[PDB]
């Protein structure tokens, strides 16, 4: 009927506590926000189901 809801901090997975890596990751634009928008859509749906 449902599966495990997950959320993934794209900054902490890619760059965990580094600031240099954050300033480089910003050059890809919306990809981290788009990943969290996708996993939030999956997570809201587990309650709809």
């Amino acid at each position: 009927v449902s599966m495990t809801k997950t959320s993934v901090d794209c900054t902490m997975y890619i760059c965990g506590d580094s600031t240099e890596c954050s300033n480089l990751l910003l050059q890809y634009g919306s990809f981290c926000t788009q990943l969290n928008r996708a996993l939030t859509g999956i997570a809201v749906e587990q309650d709809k189901n």
Binding site: D9, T11, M12, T40
Partner: protein
């Protein structure tokens, strides 16, 4: 400024509809620095 301003800024809208919104993860930052090196007094013999 405040948690609502961070939602307006994350939704890219000056108005926010009713809901619960995920925002920037919090994280406690360093209180101080540490260094721990083995205590050695003698310099390396690079002249030799």
């Amino acid at each position: 400024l405040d948690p609502l301003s961070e939602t307006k800024c994350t939704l890219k809208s000056f108005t926010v509809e009713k809901g619960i919104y995920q925002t920037s993860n919090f994280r406690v930052q360093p209180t101080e620095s540490i260094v721990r090196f083995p205590n050695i007094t003698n310099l390396c013999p690079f002249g030799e």
